[PDB]
Amino acid sequence: GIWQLDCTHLEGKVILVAVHVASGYIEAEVIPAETGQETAYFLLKLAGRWPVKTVHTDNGSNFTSTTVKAACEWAGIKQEFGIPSMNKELKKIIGQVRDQAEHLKTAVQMAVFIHNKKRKGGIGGYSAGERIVDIIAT
Amino acid sequence: GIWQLDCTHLEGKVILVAVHVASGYIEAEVIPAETGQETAYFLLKLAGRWPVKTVHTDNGSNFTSTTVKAACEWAGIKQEFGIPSMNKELKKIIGQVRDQAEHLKTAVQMAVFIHNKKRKGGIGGYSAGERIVDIIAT
Numbered sequence: 125g126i127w128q129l130d131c132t133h134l135e136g137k138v139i140l141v142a143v144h145v146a147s148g149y150i151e152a153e154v155i156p157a158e159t160g161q162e163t164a165y166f167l168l169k170l171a172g173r174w175p176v177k178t179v180h181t182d183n184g185s186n187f188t189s190t191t192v193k194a195a196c197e198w199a200g201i202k203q204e205f206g207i208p209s210m211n212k213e214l215k216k217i218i219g220q221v222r223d224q225a226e227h228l229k230t231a232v233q234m235a236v237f238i239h240n241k242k243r244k245g246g247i248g249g250y251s252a253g254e255r256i257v258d259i260i261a262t
Numbered sequence: 263g264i265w266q267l268d269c270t271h272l273e274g275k276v277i278l279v280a281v282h283v284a285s286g287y288i289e290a291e292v293i294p295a296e297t298g299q300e301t302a303y304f305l306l307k308l309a310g311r312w313p314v315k316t317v318h319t320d321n322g323s324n325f326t327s328t329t330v331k332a333a334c335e336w337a338g339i340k341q342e343f344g345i346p347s348m349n350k351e352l353k354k355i356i357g358q359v360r361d362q363a364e365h366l367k368t369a370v371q372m373a374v375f376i377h378n379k380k381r382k383g384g385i386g387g388y389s390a391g392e393r394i395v396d397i398i399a400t
């Protein structure tokens with residue numbers, strides 16, 4: 125149930141990125157402007173899909189949102205400070221698709237798709253999408 | 263990889279619902295007004311998360327959207343006509359939470375959460391969320 129949440133920026137829009145740490149599986153979303161509400165909405169969606177026990181963030185923003193607090197509590201997500209390359213390689217894949225899409229969000233989702241379905245170096249072993257299912261099945 | 267897509271309506275807003283047929287797992291989203299684009303966006307998101315091989319719909323709307331067609335083709339989703347209670351029991355769970363939320367979409371996601379994490383009749387056996395992971399792990 126361990127995730128990292130961070131955010132990243134492109135064409136002046138904010139991309140929320142959750143990583144399932146043991147798998148490298150990602151979910152992402154383009155949000156209107158870093159709000160408590162939208163982070164809360166993304167958390168509640170993610171927790172309804174996967175076991176989400178602990179979310180690790182690297183700064184204080186998410187500790188100051190009333191709605192994130194209520195989402196955390198509603199869904200039983202521990203907020204934990206501290207995070208003991210992803211953003212970067214998702215952007216490479218976004219640039220290779222960017223023109224195949226009117227909306228930035230469609231390119232973000234095409235990039236999430238490829239990241240989660242790819243095999244590491246293109247052959248053999250498991251996708252991030254397969255590893256997350258394999259870890260939760262065990 | 264078999265899903266059903268349908269849509270439903272509440273407080274004058276449209277809720278897109280995908281069901282993984284063997285599991286009963288659901289994903290849902292509140293969209294602005296039944297567009298090709300937003301259905302396409304929802305499909306591309308879903309396929310990046312789960313194996314999505316075939317989507318079954320019960321009418322023609324999704325066969326007339328250029329963007330749905332391109333999403334289908336990009337992600338390798340077969341669109342199939344014909345669907346050989348869900349909407350209804352999701353609405354019961356929405357009514358029990360509706361007041362716990364400013365936005366309808368938050369109540370939809372609280373209802374998706376409970377539907378996917380619940381056990382059938384409250385004890386024993388597996389949640390829809392556990393069955394989808396168990397079916398794909400096998």
Ligand SMILES: C#Cc1oc2ccc(C)cc2c1CC(=O)O
Pocket residue numbers: 161162164165166168191194195198362363364365366368369
């Ligand atoms: C947008 C948004 C949003 O997402 C959430 C997730 C969990 C909880 C308890 C609350 C919210 C809200 C605000 C609300 O609708 O009450």
Ligand SMILES: C#Cc1oc2ccc(C)cc2c1CC(=O)O
Pocket residue numbers: 224225226227228230231299300302303304306329332333336
């Ligand atoms: C909104 C939206 C949207 O979602 C998609 C999913 C797959 C594909 C090929 C295209 C789109 C678009 C339109 C676009 O951004 O080109």
